[PDB]
């Protein structure tokens, strides 16, 4: 052990397309690491790049085929499973 870490969060992103639903895209980002030490969750959607970033570790880019806004973006973090559900 010299430069190995376990406190590093390992997220896993899953993407799913929906047609005719309240959401057109479902994105699943769960935290699955040996340990990981998440602090806060401050996601934000930048219209400039049309990307919804979760934290300064990973960002979720939206396809330009979809019109997405802060009012359409549904972000819910379940602590029970340490999973972050994104519905757009």
């Amino acid at each position: 052990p010299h430069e190995q870490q376990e406190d590093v969060p390992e997220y896993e992103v899953k993407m799913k397309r929906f047609k005719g639903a309240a959401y057109k895209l479902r994105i699943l980002i769960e935290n699955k690491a040996p340990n990981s030490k998440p602090d806060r969750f401050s996601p934000s959607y930048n219209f400039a790049e049309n990307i919804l970033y979760i934290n300064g570790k990973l960002s979720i880019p939206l396809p330009r085929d979809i019109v997405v806004n802060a009012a359409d973006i549904k972000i819910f973090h379940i602590r029970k499973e340490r999973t972050l559900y994104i519905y757009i």
């Binding site: 219209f47 819910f76 973090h77 379940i78």
Partner: peptide
């Protein structure tokens, strides 16, 4: 350019409300 970015409020729930698709 269109330098507009908005923060999205995240709700920390134990699961999504009815109507959502959870797996």
């Amino acid at each position: 350019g269109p330098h507009m970015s908005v923060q999205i409020p995240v709700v920390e729930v134990d699961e999504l409300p009815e109507g959502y698709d959870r797996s």
